[PDB]
Amino acid sequence: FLNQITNYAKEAVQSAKYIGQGLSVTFDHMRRRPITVQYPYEKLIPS
Amino acid sequence: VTQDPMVTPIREFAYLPAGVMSGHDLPAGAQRAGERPEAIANTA
Amino acid sequence: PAILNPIARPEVPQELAENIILTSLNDVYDWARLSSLWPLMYGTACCFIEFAAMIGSRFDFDRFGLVPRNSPRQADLIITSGTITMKMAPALVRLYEQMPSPKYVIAMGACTITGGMFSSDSYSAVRGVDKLIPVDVYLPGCPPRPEAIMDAIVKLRKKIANEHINERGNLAQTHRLFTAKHKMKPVPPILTGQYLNAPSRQAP
Amino acid sequence: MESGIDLQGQFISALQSLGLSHDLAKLLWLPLPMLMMLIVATVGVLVAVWLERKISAAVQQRIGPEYIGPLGILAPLADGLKLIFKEDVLPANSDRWLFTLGPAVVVIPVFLSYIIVPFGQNLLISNLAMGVFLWIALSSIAPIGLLMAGYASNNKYSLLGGLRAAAQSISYEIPLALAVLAVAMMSNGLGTVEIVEQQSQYGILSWNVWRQPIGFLVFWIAALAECERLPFDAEEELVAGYQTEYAGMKFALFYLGAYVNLVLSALLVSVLYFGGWSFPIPLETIANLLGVSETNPFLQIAFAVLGITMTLIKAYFFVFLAILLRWTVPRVRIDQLLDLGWKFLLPVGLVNLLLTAGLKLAFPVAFGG
Amino acid sequence: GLLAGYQFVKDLESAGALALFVPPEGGFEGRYQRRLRSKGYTTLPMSAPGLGDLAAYLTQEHGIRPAHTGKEDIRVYFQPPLVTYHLENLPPNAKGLVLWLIDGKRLSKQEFAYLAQLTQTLPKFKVVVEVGGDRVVRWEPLADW
Amino acid sequence: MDLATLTQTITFFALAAAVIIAALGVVLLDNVVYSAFLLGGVFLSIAGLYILMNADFVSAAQILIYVGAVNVLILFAIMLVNKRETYTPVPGRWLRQGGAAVVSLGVFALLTKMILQTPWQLSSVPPTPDSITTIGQHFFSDFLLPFELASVLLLMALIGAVVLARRELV
Amino acid sequence: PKIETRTEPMVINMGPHHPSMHGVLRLMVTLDGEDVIDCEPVIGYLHRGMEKIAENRTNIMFIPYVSRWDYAAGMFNEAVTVNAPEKLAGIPVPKRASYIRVIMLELNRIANHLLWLGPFLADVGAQTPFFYIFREREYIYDLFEAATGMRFINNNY
Amino acid sequence: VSTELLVLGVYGALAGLYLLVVPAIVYAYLNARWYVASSFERAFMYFLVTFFFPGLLLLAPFINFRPQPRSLN
Amino acid sequence: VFVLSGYEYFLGFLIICSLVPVLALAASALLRPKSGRMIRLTTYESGMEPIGGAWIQFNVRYYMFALVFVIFDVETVFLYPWAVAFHQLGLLAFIEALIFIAILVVALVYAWRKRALEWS
Amino acid sequence: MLLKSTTRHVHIYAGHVVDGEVHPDTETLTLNVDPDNELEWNEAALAKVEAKFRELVANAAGEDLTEYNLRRIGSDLEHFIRSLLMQGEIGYNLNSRVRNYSLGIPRVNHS
Ligand code: SF4
């Protein structure tokens, strides 16, 4: 009865693919321009 | 804030024109959203 | 007396550091404590959310050097970000006393400068955090916007760069220790931790 | 040198030219590679703190610790120096011997394990025939400084945090040992020079990550739970974390020991499962294509710098992968990480050891000798 | 990184009132305040926009009139003149008193001229008004403005 | 004793003094956590002693098991039974302690007599530096039956120590 | 090191210094092995007395006070504090004022759920979009700053 | 010229490159393209900070990466 | 006769790596505030007094995890000389080590099935 | 549970200090006049504050040992310390690191 061994490896490889996908999409966050309003040289105008 | 010669001043969100979310990519002082009440009086 | 709350004349105290090597090491010491400045993750009220708006991405907290700490033992700074009540005041003095000695306080918002809008008709609000703690920089604004908080941090850095390394000794406590015997009756601990297991929730 | 380049031999020969003994010249040579490796570990902890505060900022669309140097380069150094300046606290009935020794016991063997790491062939402190096994044995001393730092504080939630960190830190010693055991099978030894030398034959095809695809994963996940990182570490577990009573240089010892363990574990992923210093093309192939001998001193210098760059490329890549995976993965609580240590990484390490023994017995030319 | 000597105290003793130009990111000019304090001076770091009518606040008595929060009366508090009270409550062999104003911006030219003339008239009193801005810490005398 | 044998003798006497001092601290200390940490000190100095007499795998095994696993288990159980017991001294403490001291000193005097009296058959051939390869050849040779019986010993020890240290709330 | 090890249930404090965005409350829980047996929440570390302050404040000068109860959606507090003398005196509101009120209150509901959502994902273990939630909350802040003058709380709107 | 002296000369040249020259080139590359860089280029320049880090630490108190004063015109 | 090669650096690097926290703490203790005529000595307890008795609960999970660590740590140290001396040993030593590994795999199944690998 | 009243310039700490630890005692309570040195504290006014504190803790006999009564004793001692500072018997420190005048600015007596 190997119904819980293959399910175990399936859960492991689904978590591995989830970690690989989340690692690919957190690597697409570094390419975005930072939204930091750099205060002493970029004082944001009040309304 | 706009008259200090060490600051690049940034309009926050409600003064960025009509499609802009962050005021960092602003090219040269583009205005708030669009027309003002001295325009529809000339339009209609 | 002709001066009501007078200042006092010092004992002519001067370090007179004519050395340029120890002056540069003092510069390194002040720059190192200046550019690290790890604050305590301390909240308690409205102002903390603006403090949290510094830790986010739009205004950057880290780009002056300061990362928030959970324990006060690793905390270099405390930004008192909200109203200090009569219940919160001994807890605040305790978590200030649990910090290492080169520590700095910023009275953030009107609730810690003077107890701003609770300075009139409140019975349980400490009117100013300087009734409890020695304060370095005061920060107005009821919700001071995060540019004002990292302006208070800039003025705190200007304060830190002045500190002399031979002047360590102002970091003392200077015990007085007057002990008196008293005749008050001890009461039991009213708040123990028994809420649902107390034998009054089960039946009227 | 003329015949080659041997700074040990040239130093001992030029120090015997003053009128010293031979053993005294060897004794005066002795602190120099150790001082060089401590310099490498110190620049490694500064690089690790800088990369941690800059890649975490670049993920969250922020700018890192600016205004401390040109970039944030002097940001770790000030974070070192400030912790030298802060006072002691001694939490209210603390042991005052075990309290100061806890950080020392938890960071001394991690520093001592830098004998094992090579930056090139004989570019290390010692070969040490039981190399990676001694690294595992020395890394097993960490949940004694953890329990020492937990006990010697008079408060709870740090004793609880100390027992929690010690139960985490022993749950991943055995999958680490099994994943190193597979490489020690494939390398016929435990010295890291011999471990890299069995991979620096065909450049990139003889690397151990292609022959241990799951052993590399077991070692990487188990080494990311020995360094107290990622999911295996925003309210704390209970209220406190075994170092909430450490203030100045002792918290600095904890803080630098974590990143020194991270840099050492990344270096050992680079050494064990990748080439420790090997270019993806074998170096003697380029030496015979150039026609110049592999013993003349300028090719010696060029190949040594190239091996140092390859070591630092792979160590940087795994430090980068740890700083990415700190913000990639969800933070798991203590029971899920202990189930990952005992119920997942230990059976995968055991079945990896069994299948690599079957592969070495069946196909011995591909897996060692 | 810019090992600064004690030239700053010499420019302070020369000009009497110098305008500082500090980088706006924080504490890179307080090394000069500590150099100035190490030579025997007493620095009095206070914020300039909180002062009003520096002829009255610095050397005159001025009624403060603190905040009654709807409870007390007007209750005028007569603060002593800051420069002369901090100069008389000083050691007699000290080098002098220095007013370290940390916001030289949002002040007028008239107050700058008054601060320079005030440092010129009474003997041991120097101001280091921080008008801010510049990329490095650089100072001018308060002569033209 | 130029520099190498001098360093070996200095290291041997330093580690021997460390074993003796830390083992006395394991016995003769009131705080049991100090004994539980000085036990790891004993094991580390004994591993250095094994390094001195050409046993590097056995020294690494000594660090990995005794420091890494046995001392950690002892510290865990010490924190588990950590209380504030009084330990009132019994009036017959002489009959235990003086008898124990004279028995230990008698066994030490007897063992020192037979150690300094026996003509040990010292070898002149240098030992092998490759210890772990000969130990691995020994495990599937002469020492194969203890190697297989140690697995059954470990399985039984795990079974019994899971059974006896359990709660059976049914 | 006077921490003994008993067999009775312990007590975890979780006191008023919360090292996250959890407010100021004590959470003295017992939790014998892991099961939380009892839980006494201690309340009142921010009790400043708005109910006694209100009896000495005109409604035009209590509107700056009412942002400080639910200080993530501040105008919701004004949405009752204005509506309480509105329905005694029977003062009608315009339709445009009512729609502006609906827009401000629904933006405040979005901002309140965002400030709940940040710490909730940080406590559940996600902890990646904590820094990405404050960006849209800053968008709502800059929307409130144009109309009301201030950000999320101190509106006299 | 002696070949030992030329080996020490290329050692001194490599030390002057690793500590002074290419860290200055890396600093001149980082006030340059940093936002125009991709994710892989950001990883490459973070490697350039990682590898030449003692030279960046030596050159750190002498570079002035502050924004220039504005024109107001 | 001491024939081990590479341990003349191990003793010196142990000495210097033991001195680097000692030198770090001594350089900290030289330049530091010597201060505090009142209570440095307070426990944290999340901002206030020690609440709820100075004890933790007896939980045998700390024993069980260290116990299974002892068992499989002994397993791995037996498996190390089998692993490094594998190229000099045939299929029979692989079968004998397979018997060893299989008995301790049954030990792991026992430690898993009985609730000994649990929460902490 | 340690009973205390910690504000600025007084710390009550119902209990006795041993080495750097205050152990919670029932029938005593300590006093830590100015633990941060905003004031100068010559020995005459220090003895005055000590005598006022002993009078205050004698007049507080028979009440509970709650933190409310300790805070009342500390607040009355705070008002006495501020009255001594206002009379001119106590000066501000001026060697401190903060200098924020937590008990009022200096001011002349009448005008
Ligand atoms: S000052 Fe205003 S925003 Fe800050 S805590 Fe007080 S009431 Fe809230």
Side-chain angles (χ1 to χ4, degrees), chain E residues 102-129:
Chain E
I102 67 186
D103 271 328
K105 318 203 293 291
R106 71 182 73 96
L107 260 70
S108 54
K109 253 67 175 169
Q110 316 268 341
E111 285 152 324
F112 289 149
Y114 176 68
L115 278 165
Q117 289 159 25
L118 195 68
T119 57
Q120 287 178 34
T121 54
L122 70 153
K124 37 172 68 176
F125 176 49
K126 280 81 177 176
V127 305
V128 198
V129 196

CSV table of all heavy atoms in Angstrom, one decimal, chain E residues 102-129:
chain,number,residue,atom,x,y,z
E,102,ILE,N,20.5,75.3,15.3
E,102,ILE,CA,20.5,74.2,14.4
E,102,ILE,C,19.6,74.3,13.2
E,102,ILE,O,19.5,73.5,12.3
E,102,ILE,CB,20.1,72.9,15.1
E,102,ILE,CG1,18.6,72.9,15.6
E,102,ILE,CG2,21.0,72.6,16.3
E,102,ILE,CD1,18.2,71.8,16.4
E,103,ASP,N,18.9,75.4,13.1
E,103,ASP,CA,18.0,75.7,11.9
E,103,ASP,C,18.3,77.2,11.5
E,103,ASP,O,17.6,78.1,11.8
E,103,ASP,CB,16.6,75.5,12.2
E,103,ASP,CG,16.1,74.1,11.9
E,103,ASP,OD1,16.7,73.5,11.0
E,103,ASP,OD2,15.2,73.6,12.6
E,104,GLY,N,19.4,77.4,10.7
E,104,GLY,CA,19.6,78.7,10.1
E,104,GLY,C,18.6,79.1,9.0
E,104,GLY,O,18.4,80.2,8.8
E,105,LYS,N,18.0,78.1,8.4
E,105,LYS,CA,17.0,78.3,7.5
E,105,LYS,C,15.7,78.8,8.2
E,105,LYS,O,15.7,78.9,9.5
E,105,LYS,CB,16.6,77.1,6.7
E,105,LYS,CG,17.8,76.3,6.2
E,105,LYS,CD,17.5,75.4,5.0
E,105,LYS,CE,16.5,74.3,5.4
E,105,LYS,NZ,17.1,73.3,6.2
E,106,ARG,N,14.7,79.3,7.5
E,106,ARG,CA,13.5,79.9,7.9
E,106,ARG,C,13.7,81.1,8.9
E,106,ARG,O,12.9,81.4,9.8
E,106,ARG,CB,12.5,78.9,8.4
E,106,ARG,CG,12.7,78.2,9.8
E,106,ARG,CD,11.6,77.2,10.1
E,106,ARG,NE,11.6,76.0,9.2
E,106,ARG,CZ,12.2,74.8,9.5
E,106,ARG,NH1,12.7,74.7,10.8
E,106,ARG,NH2,12.2,73.8,8.7
E,107,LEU,N,14.9,81.8,8.8
E,107,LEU,CA,15.2,83.0,9.5
E,107,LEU,C,15.5,84.1,8.5
E,107,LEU,O,15.9,83.8,7.3
E,107,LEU,CB,16.4,82.8,10.4
E,107,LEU,CG,16.1,82.6,11.9
E,107,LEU,CD1,15.4,81.2,12.1
E,107,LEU,CD2,17.3,82.7,12.8
E,108,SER,N,15.4,85.3,8.9
E,108,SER,CA,15.6,86.5,8.0
E,108,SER,C,17.0,86.9,8.0
E,108,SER,O,17.9,86.5,8.8
E,108,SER,CB,14.7,87.6,8.5
E,108,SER,OG,14.9,87.9,9.8
E,109,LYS,N,17.3,87.8,7.0
E,109,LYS,CA,18.6,88.4,6.9
E,109,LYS,C,18.9,89.4,8.1
E,109,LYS,O,20.1,89.6,8.5
E,109,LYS,CB,18.8,89.1,5.6
E,109,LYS,CG,19.7,88.4,4.6
E,109,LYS,CD,19.1,87.1,4.1
E,109,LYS,CE,20.0,86.5,3.0
E,109,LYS,NZ,19.6,85.1,2.7
E,110,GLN,N,17.8,90.0,8.6
E,110,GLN,CA,18.0,91.0,9.7
E,110,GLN,C,18.4,90.3,11.0
E,110,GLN,O,19.3,90.8,11.7
E,110,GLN,CB,16.6,91.7,9.9
E,110,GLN,CG,15.9,92.1,8.7
E,110,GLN,CD,16.3,93.5,8.3
E,110,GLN,OE1,16.8,94.3,9.1
E,110,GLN,NE2,16.1,93.9,7.0
E,111,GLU,N,17.9,89.0,11.2
E,111,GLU,CA,18.3,88.3,12.4
E,111,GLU,C,19.8,87.8,12.2
E,111,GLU,O,20.5,87.7,13.2
E,111,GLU,CB,17.3,87.1,12.6
E,111,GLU,CG,16.0,87.6,13.2
E,111,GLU,CD,14.9,86.7,12.8
E,111,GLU,OE1,14.9,86.2,11.7
E,111,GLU,OE2,14.0,86.5,13.7
E,112,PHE,N,20.2,87.5,11.0
E,112,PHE,CA,21.6,87.1,10.8
E,112,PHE,C,22.5,88.3,11.1
E,112,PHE,O,23.6,88.1,11.7
E,112,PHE,CB,21.8,86.7,9.3
E,112,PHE,CG,21.2,85.3,9.0
E,112,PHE,CD1,20.7,85.1,7.8
E,112,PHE,CD2,21.1,84.4,10.0
E,112,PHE,CE1,20.1,83.8,7.5
E,112,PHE,CE2,20.5,83.1,9.7
E,112,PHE,CZ,20.1,82.9,8.5
E,113,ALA,N,22.2,89.5,10.6
E,113,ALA,CA,23.0,90.7,10.8
E,113,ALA,C,23.0,91.0,12.3
E,113,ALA,O,24.0,91.4,12.8
E,113,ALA,CB,22.4,91.8,10.0
E,114,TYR,N,21.9,90.8,13.0
E,114,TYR,CA,21.8,91.1,14.4
E,114,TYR,C,22.7,90.1,15.2
E,114,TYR,O,23.3,90.5,16.2
E,114,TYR,CB,20.4,91.0,14.9
E,114,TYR,CG,20.3,91.2,16.4
E,114,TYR,CD1,20.7,92.4,17.0
E,114,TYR,CD2,20.0,90.2,17.3
E,114,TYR,CE1,20.7,92.6,18.4
E,114,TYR,CE2,19.9,90.3,18.6
E,114,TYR,CZ,20.3,91.5,19.2
E,114,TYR,OH,20.3,91.7,20.6
E,115,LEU,N,22.7,88.8,14.8
E,115,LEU,CA,23.5,87.8,15.5
E,115,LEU,C,25.0,88.1,15.3
E,115,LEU,O,25.8,88.0,16.2
E,115,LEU,CB,23.1,86.4,15.0
E,115,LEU,CG,21.9,85.8,15.6
E,115,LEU,CD1,21.4,84.6,14.8
E,115,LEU,CD2,22.2,85.4,17.0
E,116,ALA,N,25.4,88.5,14.1
E,116,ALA,CA,26.8,88.8,13.8
E,116,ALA,C,27.2,90.1,14.6
E,116,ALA,O,28.3,90.1,15.3
E,116,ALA,CB,27.0,89.1,12.3
E,117,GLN,N,26.4,91.1,14.6
E,117,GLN,CA,26.7,92.3,15.4
E,117,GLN,C,26.7,92.0,16.9
E,117,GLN,O,27.4,92.6,17.7
E,117,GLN,CB,25.7,93.4,15.1
E,117,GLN,CG,25.9,94.0,13.7
E,117,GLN,CD,24.7,94.8,13.2
E,117,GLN,OE1,23.9,95.2,14.0
E,117,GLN,NE2,24.6,94.9,11.9
E,118,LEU,N,25.8,91.1,17.4
E,118,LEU,CA,25.8,90.7,18.8
E,118,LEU,C,27.0,90.0,19.2
E,118,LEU,O,27.6,90.1,20.3
E,118,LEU,CB,24.5,89.9,19.1
E,118,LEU,CG,24.2,89.8,20.6
E,118,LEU,CD1,23.8,91.1,21.1
E,118,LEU,CD2,23.1,88.7,20.7
E,119,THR,N,27.5,89.1,18.3
E,119,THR,CA,28.8,88.5,18.6
E,119,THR,C,30.0,89.4,18.5
E,119,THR,O,31.0,89.2,19.2
E,119,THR,CB,29.1,87.3,17.6
E,119,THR,OG1,29.1,87.9,16.2
E,119,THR,CG2,28.1,86.2,17.7
E,120,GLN,N,29.8,90.5,17.7
E,120,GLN,CA,30.9,91.5,17.7
E,120,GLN,C,30.9,92.4,19.0
E,120,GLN,O,32.0,92.8,19.4
E,120,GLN,CB,30.8,92.4,16.4
E,120,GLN,CG,31.2,91.6,15.2
E,120,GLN,CD,31.0,92.5,13.9
E,120,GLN,OE1,31.2,93.7,14.0
E,120,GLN,NE2,30.6,91.8,12.8
E,121,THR,N,29.7,92.7,19.5
E,121,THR,CA,29.7,93.7,20.6
E,121,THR,C,30.1,93.2,21.9
E,121,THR,O,31.2,93.6,22.5
E,121,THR,CB,28.3,94.4,20.7
E,121,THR,OG1,27.3,93.4,20.8
E,121,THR,CG2,28.1,95.3,19.5
E,122,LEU,N,29.4,92.2,22.5
E,122,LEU,CA,29.8,91.7,23.8
E,122,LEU,C,30.9,90.6,23.6
E,122,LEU,O,30.8,89.8,22.7
E,122,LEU,CB,28.6,91.2,24.6
E,122,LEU,CG,27.8,89.9,24.3
E,122,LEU,CD1,27.2,89.4,25.6
E,122,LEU,CD2,26.7,90.2,23.4
E,123,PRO,N,31.9,90.6,24.5
E,123,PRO,CA,33.2,90.0,24.1
E,123,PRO,C,33.3,88.5,23.9
E,123,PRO,O,33.8,88.1,22.9
E,123,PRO,CB,34.1,90.4,25.3
E,123,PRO,CG,33.2,90.6,26.4
E,123,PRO,CD,32.0,91.2,25.9
E,124,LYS,N,32.7,87.7,24.8
E,124,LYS,CA,32.8,86.3,24.7
E,124,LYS,C,31.5,85.7,24.4
E,124,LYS,O,30.8,85.2,25.3
E,124,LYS,CB,33.5,85.7,26.0
E,124,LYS,CG,33.0,86.4,27.3
E,124,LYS,CD,33.6,85.6,28.5
E,124,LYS,CE,35.1,85.7,28.6
E,124,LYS,NZ,35.6,85.0,29.8
E,125,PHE,N,31.1,85.7,23.1
E,125,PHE,CA,29.9,85.1,22.6
E,125,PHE,C,30.0,84.9,21.1
E,125,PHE,O,30.2,85.9,20.4
E,125,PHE,CB,28.7,86.0,23.0
E,125,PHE,CG,27.4,85.5,22.4
E,125,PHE,CD1,27.0,84.2,22.6
E,125,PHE,CD2,26.6,86.3,21.7
E,125,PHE,CE1,25.8,83.7,22.1
E,125,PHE,CE2,25.4,85.9,21.2
E,125,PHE,CZ,25.0,84.6,21.4
E,126,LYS,N,29.9,83.7,20.7
E,126,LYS,CA,30.0,83.3,19.3
E,126,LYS,C,28.8,82.5,18.9
E,126,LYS,O,28.3,81.7,19.6
E,126,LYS,CB,31.3,82.6,19.0
E,126,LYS,CG,32.6,83.4,18.9
E,126,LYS,CD,33.2,83.8,20.2
E,126,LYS,CE,34.5,84.6,20.0
E,126,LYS,NZ,35.0,85.0,21.3
E,127,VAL,N,28.3,82.7,17.6
E,127,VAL,CA,27.2,81.9,17.1
E,127,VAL,C,27.7,81.1,15.9
E,127,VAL,O,28.5,81.5,15.1
E,127,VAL,CB,26.0,82.7,16.8
E,127,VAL,CG1,25.5,83.5,18.0
E,127,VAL,CG2,26.2,83.7,15.6
E,128,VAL,N,27.1,79.9,15.8
E,128,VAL,CA,27.4,78.9,14.7
E,128,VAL,C,26.1,78.5,14.0
E,128,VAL,O,25.7,77.4,14.0
E,128,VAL,CB,28.2,77.7,15.2
E,128,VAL,CG1,28.8,76.9,14.1
E,128,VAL,CG2,29.2,78.1,16.3
E,129,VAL,N,25.3,79.6,13.7
E,129,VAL,CA,24.0,79.4,12.9
E,129,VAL,C,24.2,78.5,11.7
E,129,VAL,O,25.0,78.7,10.8
E,129,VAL,CB,23.5,80.8,12.5
E,129,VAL,CG1,22.1,80.7,12.1
E,129,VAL,CG2,23.7,81.8,13.6
